[PDB]
Amino acid sequence: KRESGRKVQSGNINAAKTIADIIRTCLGPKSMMKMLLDPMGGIVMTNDGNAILREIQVQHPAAKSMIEISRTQDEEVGDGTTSVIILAGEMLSVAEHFLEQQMHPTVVISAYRKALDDMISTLKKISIPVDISDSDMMLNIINSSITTKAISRWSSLACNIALDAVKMVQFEENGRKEIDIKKYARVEKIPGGIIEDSCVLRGVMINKDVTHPRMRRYIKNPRIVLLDSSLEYKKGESQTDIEITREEDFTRILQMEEEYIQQLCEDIIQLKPDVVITEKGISDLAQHYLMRANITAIRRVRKTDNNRIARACGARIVSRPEELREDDVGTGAGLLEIKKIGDEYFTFITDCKDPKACTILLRGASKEILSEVERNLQDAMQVCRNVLLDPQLVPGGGASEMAVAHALTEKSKAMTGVEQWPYRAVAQALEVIPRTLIQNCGASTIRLLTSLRAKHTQENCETWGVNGETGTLVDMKELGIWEPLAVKLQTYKTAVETAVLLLRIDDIVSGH
């Protein structure tokens, strides 16, 4: 029914801790697999933290919050999501100070929020900039995802695709340097070819099919037209259908259907275009004028998809076709091609311009290999987004965790009060990240984690992390495990903000 008292906070901890214990071993390159018993007796042997929790049923609402916060991470950053839940579960797993010591959550939350400002400052100290102009460094950075994948045979290809693609979308002139991979980097697959044939189209590719053969097959100077209205007979304000029974009234309603569709098409062809792109559908009578005009018929193109076209070829959006002025012409466009590349038509309006958007062409030998190349390239685009938004990397392999933990432990010495105890407990929670990397490799956890903390005390904290493959210690200057800063800061805030959230819950109430 409901929960109240200390049972709530201790219950939310066991729920969040239980969800993290599932994916404790799903961290690093030597991640362990998980067996998911389907209801029909089947098994899925995935090792992805997002896919595991997505398929698991959870009864506690605290678990739904942990999972729903992880999904929000995937939309922004396709990496480090597993670290959020583990840290959020370890930060909450310290229930000694929470209940056994009878401290109020406001005392704990004030310490967790104080450490978060210190964890953020320490990560910027151990950071390091990157020369984004040199693509060789970004290759080593993007290899964190290409490693242990089938696309390693064309690893450099994936970097040049993702690197150059995000640079086109990056509109730095607006100050904030916003990037939109979902809209301005729309990806579409093309059957045929191989992995090497994968490239980036410098334009906008529409997957519209060819309905008739009377369409422009190859053009050197396209002329694209844009409009939102539909090419059909003007209906009434309501959706009332036209019901007719008298034959004499048919020719009247038919003539009204033909003339208005006729006059609207006559104005579209006055500019001598090569393709009519409309947002809404195009009826059969309207297509009879497009095939007669020897121009391509295109429809069902969204607003943002049309906005990129006007920036590419120089077209102009109009409400209706009747108001089409001479400005709506795609002069300077590269070419218009509706070739059937791999048993599927593809509209290419590429040009020699970068209209703050592009389209990625995924060539491949089969749908299985195409999907493998697809999901592997999206993460590379996001790593390029995170580095280009904030070109600062921090040492990975558990080094940034141990480096930050030493700063809090040394800073807690001057922390007079009861908040020093949970403030230090957050530092010991960061050690769980190398604790799992060492557990997966099989090396002794206590022996290496003890020596690992000693290296950060004496030697510089910017290096001396952990090697997940070998298990021994290694400097991140010698091993390119450097991860972005924006991923770690958002990973650290989301873990503390999530733990602060569940700690603020004291009564699970039902009602609507």
């Binding site: 239980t18 697999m33 998980k34 067996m35 018993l37 389907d38 209801p39 398929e55 698991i56 009864q59």
Partner: protein, 521 residues
């Protein structure tokens, strides 16, 4: 630590659940390894019985109760799709790999350390396979040893010489000048009313539907093959008309006019028959897929034509590439350029049905292997053995290298791994030792099924050492060592190659399983 309506195995006992399933599946399939191995029955529940030793059939068609064991069954499907052999030996090595790993995992060893040893033992075992393979030329004497080695594992040691010569000759007819090979060129037919040993080859092709008229020729020693797809039965009016009648007889009178479009096209058939060698000591055959009217059949039958009707898409496909007759979709464009040619064309009468045979062709690029048996399941068992025998001869021809059998490669690779110090990690050799002992399960099981001691057989073949290339195997009749290359036992290079790639990947992934969770089960 779990939500309601679910379950979770947190500790390492989840791994023991997967090890127990593989150990159980090992003990099931080990009794059907090799020729002397037993057979397993597949009761479909409806009442159909089926006996077979093919591990792919005992895992794909047989549904497995345990959830974990069904995963390994899907791999046997994947193993059969690449090489078509080794599915049984794949499961036995997986069962022993996980068995040997549990001995060290119980001592506190992590699974990830053992899997890194398998990756090292695989590369060493893969390099040693390159040295043992024999790249000799493939001759009829060699492929017979391959076909016998592949067919004796699926039959009662009586259909060996029967299906061996058929399986070998079927392949040699479809490869010359280093051309790429395709097993789809060989058709597999099944017929009853004869003993199991009545299997033989068919150089031509078998057709289902035969001629239907008393005046037909039972055999045509020569004829031009005319491919067609036009319905010579009663069809609708082909012109813009309808049914303008006043009674039933007037409706029937218009059907005569509707038959004018078909009846005249029958004369066009008779015309080209009389034109293209319609003289004495000659014949003509029509293979029209669609139906033919009884009255129209009377016209062609009296002219000495052996007509056929209501054929399948597969028959017309092979009939075209074999005979060369191009399909005419309308008799208006009838011409002699679309005509083929063939030798003997006859219909062998069985006790119940009949089938048309088009044997004695020059180079049809397609043949047929006619299987004969008394029962239904026996024909299916022989169909599987031929497909496994053809794919075995295919691999030996495509991949010109072959390797010895009878566990001689497994015994040699195991000795090489033991004679291999660590190179990736100190503790990795524990997995290399487990990989070595896992390979020895193959000669161990061959000694069990043959009825000999498991330990005496393996120790004798291991003691064979000399200052020269020496590869001994398990003699199923004697039990003593036996040079598999001398007696004529040869396995493919892709079979042993894919075993190491398939065994290591699955034995690795099953070891990396830390927890077993219910996804709403």
């Amino acid at each position: 630590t779990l939500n309601p309506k679910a379950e979770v195995a947190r500790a390492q006992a989840a791994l023991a659940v997967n090890i127990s399933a593989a150990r159980g599946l090992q003990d099931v399939l080990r009794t059907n390894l090799g020729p002397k191995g037993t057979m397993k029955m597949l009761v479909s529940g409806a009442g159909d019985i089926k006996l077979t030793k093919d591990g792919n059939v005992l895992l794909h068609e047989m549904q497995i109760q345990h959830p974990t064991a069904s995963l390994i069954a899907k791999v046997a499907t994947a193993q059969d799709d690449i090489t078509g052999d080794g599915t049984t030996s794949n499961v036995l090595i997986i069962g022993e790999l996980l068995k040997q790993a549990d001995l060290y995992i119980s001592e506190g060893l992590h699974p990830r350390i053992i899997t890194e040893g398998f990756e090292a033992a695989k590369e060493k075992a893969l390099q040693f396979l390159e040295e043992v393979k024999v790249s000799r030329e493939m001759d009829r004497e060699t492929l017979i040893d391959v076909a016998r080695t592949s067919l004796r594992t699926k039959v009662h040691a009586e259909l060996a010489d029967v299906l061996t010569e058929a399986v070998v000759d079927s392949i040699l007819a479809i490869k010359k000048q280093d051309e790429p090979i395709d097993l789809f060129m060989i058709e597999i037919m099944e017929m009853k009313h004869k003993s199991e040993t009545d299997t033989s080859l068919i150089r031509g092709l078998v057709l289902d539907h035969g001629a239907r008229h008393p005046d037909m020729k039972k055999r045509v020693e020569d004829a031009y093959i005319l491919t067609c797809n036009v319905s010579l039965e009663y069809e609708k009016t082909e012109v813009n008309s309808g049914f303008f009648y006043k009674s039933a007889e007037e409706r029937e009178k218009l059907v005569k006019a509707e038959r004018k479009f078909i009846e005249d096209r029958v004369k066009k058939i008779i015309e080209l028959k009389r034109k293209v060698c319609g003289d004495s000591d000659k014949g003509f055959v029509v293979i029209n897929q669609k139906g033919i009217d009884p009255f129209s059949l009377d016209a062609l039958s009296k002219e000495g034509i052996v007509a056929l009707r209501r054929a399948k898409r597969r028959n017309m496909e092979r009939l075209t590439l074999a005979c060369g007759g191009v399909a005419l979709n309308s008799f208006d464009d009838l011409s002699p350029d679309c005509l083929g040619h063939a030798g003997l064309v006859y219909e062998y009468t069985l006790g119940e049905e009949k089938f048309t045979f088009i044997e004695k062709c020059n180079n049809p690029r397609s043949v047929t292997l006619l299987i004969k048996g008394p029962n239904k399941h026996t024909l299916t068992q022989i169909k599987d053995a031929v497909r496994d025998g053809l794919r075995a001869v295919k691999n030996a021809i495509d991949d010109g290298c072959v390797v010895p059998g009878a566990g001689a490669v497994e015994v040699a690779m195991a000795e090489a791994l033991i004679k291999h110090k660590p190179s990736v990690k100190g503790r990795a050799q524990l997995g290399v030792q487990a990989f070595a002992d896992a390979l020895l399960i193959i000669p161990k099981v061959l000694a069990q099924n043959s009825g000999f001691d498991l330990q005496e057989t393996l120790v004798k073949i291991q003691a064979e050492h000399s200052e020269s290339g020496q590869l001994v195997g398990v003699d199923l009749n004697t039990g003593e060592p036996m040079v598999a290359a001398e007696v004529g036992v040869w396995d493919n290079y892709c079979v042993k190659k894919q075993l190491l790639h398939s065994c290591t990947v699955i034995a690795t992934n099953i070891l990396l399983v830390d927890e077993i969770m219910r996804a709403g089960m």
